[PDB]
Structure 1
Amino acid sequence: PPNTLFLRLEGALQSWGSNEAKFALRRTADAPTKSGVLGLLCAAMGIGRAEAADSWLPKLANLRMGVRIDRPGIRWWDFHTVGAGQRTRAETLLSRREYLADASFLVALQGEPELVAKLSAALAKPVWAIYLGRKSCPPSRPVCEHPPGFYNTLEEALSAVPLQKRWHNEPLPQILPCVMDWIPGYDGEHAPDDAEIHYDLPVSFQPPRHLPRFVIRRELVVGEDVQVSRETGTSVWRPKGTRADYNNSEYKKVRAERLVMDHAACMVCKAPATTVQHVNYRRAGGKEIPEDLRALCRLCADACTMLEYGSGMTTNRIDPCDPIWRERILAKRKEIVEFRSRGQRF
């Protein structure tokens, strides 16, 4: 019953060639051509060369299809200098290539579910290094997206698939152009006088011989059948770190462990202890292991806050065990003793 798979063409660069390229100006078209997705199809089966001409192009040449523009990518031109007889003589051959940049597409393939069922297990697992119609243009999205289903008409299938969104505040095309083939509703029907001819229909493959086809423009506004999709997936890293946990339930109980592990005493300037300091801020602590804290008296923990609050805040901590952060701690404690105003709090 699922008669259609929605091919997902999306990458940094892509190009399906137009007809106006025999010489060094090689161009593309503003739609994935029929033999610009059938080449992907033939690569996805793992064959190529002259095998596609028989039983692979006519195996679906009787089958209509439609394409959708998620966003119209702009046309980019890349300089390309073929070296000819250089890595004949050093005469450098010249060229220019056309690239469609940042364009997403959605092709339909409708009519029957046996070939679509064979084709559904052809996009993800079977490969012959599939790309976006150009050999050096990678598909940036899983092509096997948009799972198949029954939607009887071309517009229903082409509009009954959710439309993605990359970031939240992103402009979205409210009109989605649709490229559709010609439907012979009755025998002897003549094409409407707006249907341009596209020459994307191979009858052989190597060397390329071609047939033309009729292409009908069509339109799709968002809202009636197509709609935006859930985005999620935060593209903002900003390295994580918790902070400011007085007590959930596991600070009351975990302060005492190093309080009386060190026998109710300080560690640097040994004396009756009050509080606990934290070293190795890998996690600021909702769940704290008992080999990282440091039960330590009031004045030298105030000196620890001296040294931490000044200069960098960071995630590296003091660790008053290795004697390189010693003179500063004692000096700060000395000015704490000399200059603390208890009546002015803290």
Structure 2
Amino acid sequence: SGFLLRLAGPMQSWGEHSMFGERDTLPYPSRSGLIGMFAAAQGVRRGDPLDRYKELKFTVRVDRPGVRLVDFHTIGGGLPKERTVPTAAGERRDPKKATIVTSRSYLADAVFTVAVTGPEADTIADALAAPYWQPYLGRRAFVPDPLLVLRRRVADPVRELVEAVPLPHRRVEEDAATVLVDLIYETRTLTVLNDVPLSFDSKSRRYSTRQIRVVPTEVPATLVAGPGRDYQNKLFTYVKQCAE
């Protein structure tokens, strides 16, 4: 069981440890984010129990790391002296000091191939194919890849990440095989981070620590696509035999 989401598109930003103006993202997706996306695809309002999404497994193969960019983001500026974002007491600020400036970072031009393995994976897949809310990647303004769900049904999808999945073009030496690609499994762990989601309600966001271990694996060089227009093509023909 399981399916292979294809995390790609113009921009991605999985945030963490940022409860102020300055927002930051991780160099790889976080289960809280994509579990929020499945939850958004199944129609569970914030505050509902998320126990159903427990018992899931997410190994993610990073195709390209992508470069980090900072997004400057001012909110409430230029508006007249009687329209901004109120204060808790209700007394607005002076228009010269009214707007609030947040500089939210984001990860750009990267593509990940996650491998979901869970008991509810089939309904999750069928929910992503038709959701009850626009599914996004990190934040609402980021639009996901069209091929959000690369392969809908595969037994042992991890083996599919280790072999027979298209990769974007990169420098490959002559008649060289064994090109390394990093994938994260969850001793010899890399880091601990607040990912497991316990509650999404806006009144009390509650998360917990989760282990992460990045293993650099080797893949045969027969997956690297060509210079341009070849990668998207090869992945289309790859998603073509999904019916078969």
Which of 58-67 and 201-210 deviates more? 58-67
CA distance in 1, matches of 2:14, 2:121: 23
Amino acid at match of 1:12: P
1:48 corresponds to 2:55: no
- 3-state DSSP of counterpart to 1:149: coil
Q: Is the 8 A contact 2:25 2:106 kept in 1?
A: yes
More strand by share: 2
Q: Is the 8 A contact 1:24 1:95 kept in 2?
A: yes
Q: Superposition pairs for residues 118-267 of structure 1, below 5 Å? A: 118-151=123-156, 154=158, 156-165=159-168, 170-171=169-170, 174-181=179-186, 192-206=187-201, 207-223=204-220, 227-228=223-224, 231=230
Structure-2 residue corresponding to 1:72: 65
Q: Is the 8 A contact 1:16 1:28 kept in 2?
A: yes
CA distance in 2, matches of 1:228, 1:134: 30
CA distance in 2, matches of 1:121, 1:27: 31
Which of 118-127 and 98-107 deviates more? 118-127
Structure 2 stretches lacking a partner, 5+ long: 78-82, 86-91, 173-178, 234-244
CA distance in 1, matches of 2:126, 2:171: 32
Which of 5-14 and 82-91 deviates more? 82-91
Amino acid at match of 1:17: G
CA distance 1:120–1:202, shift in 2 (3 Å): closer
Amino acid at match of 2:123: K
Q: 1:102 aligns with which of 75, 99, 109?
A: 109
Q: For CA contacts below 8 A with separation 6 or more, give which structure has more relative contact order.
A: 2
Structure-2 residue corresponding to 1:86: 84
CA distance 1:60–1:157, shift in 2 (3 Å): farther
Q: Superposition pairs for residues 29-48 of structure 1, below 5 Å? A: 29-48=26-45
CA distance in 2, matches of 1:177, 1:147: 23
CA distance 1:26–1:233, shift in 2 (3 Å): closer
Q: Highest Rg: 1 or 2?
A: 1
CA distance in 2, matches of 1:32, 1:101: 12
Q: TM-score, normalised by structure 2?
A: 0.76
CA distance in 2, matches of 1:195, 1:232: 31
Q: Is the 8 A contact 1:146 1:161 kept in 2?
A: no
Pairwise CA RMSD of aligned residues?
2.5
1:6 corresponds to 2:4: yes
- 3-state DSSP of counterpart to 1:134: coil
Structure 1 stretches lacking a partner, 5+ long: 182-191, 235-346
CA distance in 2, matches of 1:109, 1:80: 33
- 3-state DSSP of counterpart to 2:62: strand
Q: CA deviation at 1:172?
A: 5.6
CA distance 1:102–1:46, shift in 2 (3 Å): same
Q: Is the 8 A contact 2:2 2:122 kept in 1?
A: no
CA distance in 2, matches of 1:232, 1:145: 14
In the comparison of the two structures, how many residue pairs are matched? 208
CA distance in 2, matches of 1:134, 1:32: 12
Amino acid at match of 2:112: F
CA distance in 2, matches of 1:131, 1:29: 16
Q: CA deviation at 1:111?
A: 4.2
CA distance in 1, matches of 2:131, 2:101: 36
CA distance in 2, matches of 1:149, 1:97: 37
Amino acid at match of 1:201: V
